[PDB]
Ligand binder design. Structure first.
Ligand SMILES: *SCCNC(=O)CCNC(=O)[C@H](O)C(C)(C)COP(=O)(O)OP(=O)(O)OC[C@H]1O[C@@H](n2cnc3c(N)ncnc32)[C@H](O)[C@@H]1OP(=O)(O)O
Length: 180
């Protein structure tokens, strides 16, 4: 008895040739082009800490997650903010977002980062281990985010004694991003 290998998407760090595919995915996946424009600007200016792509058998980008640096109370503690996160509508419900976030966080830990923040629906991000940032006395700069701003430590004690304003790069101060 022979079983055909199951068809699956591979996840890896993005490379330059992926940019147009990432852009197309972001434009088609969100309600506005803000996410695509954000990623373009972060990459162009050197503030995209890490990006991971999920690709189909032909190498087409079908999923994406990115991370950029954030400071806390104006200091660099090796924290990052996760955004955006997208899976092509053709591949939704297959566990690819879960995998992208897990691998992202695992890679970040491997490379010495201490925590990851994100802004979004807690009904989604809590599934991946994120906790409400307000419970740890952490906030972002935007209004109406106390229920959506979240944090995932990468070390058990990473959040202890770390409080206040978590600042994203200024490229995030554009309108229409998910979670805002
Ligand atoms: S603010 C505008 C909102 N738009 C977007 O977020 C961008 C368009 N959406 C997407 O790209 C996808 O729908 C995302 C949000 C990436 C989810 O992709 P998938 O559904 O394909 O992800 P997985 O199959 O990896 O699922 C992992 C777990 O997440 C749960 N889940 C998916 N979507 C949601 C929403 N919207 N709300 C709450 N939970 C959600 C899945 O059920 C799954 O749950 P488990 O805990 O793994 O069972």
């Amino acid at each position: 008895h022979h079983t055909d290998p199951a068809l699956r998407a591979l996840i890896r760090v993005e490379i330059p040739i992926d940019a147009p595919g990432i852009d197309a995915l972001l434009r088609r996946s969100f309600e506005s082009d803000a996410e695509a424009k954000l990623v373009h600007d972060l990459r162009e200016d050197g503030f995209l800490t890490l990006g991971l792509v999920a690709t189909d058998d032909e190498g087409q980008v079908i999923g994406y997650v990115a991370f950029s640096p954030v400071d806390v109370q104006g200091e660099d503690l090796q924290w990052v903010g996760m955004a955006p996160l997208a899976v092509d509508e053709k591949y939704r419900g297959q566990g690819l977002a879960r995998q992208l976030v897990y691998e992202g966080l695992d890679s970040l830990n491997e490379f010495g980062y201490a925590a990851v923040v994100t802004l979004g629906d807690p009904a989604l991000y809590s599934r991946f281990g994120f906790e409400l940032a307000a419970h740890h006395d952490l906030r972002c700069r935007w209004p109406g985010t106390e229920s959506a701003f979240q944090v995932h430590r990468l070390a058990d004690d990473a959040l202890n004694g770390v409080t206040g304003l978590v600042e994203y790069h200024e490229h995030f101060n554009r309108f229409g991003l998910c979670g805002r």
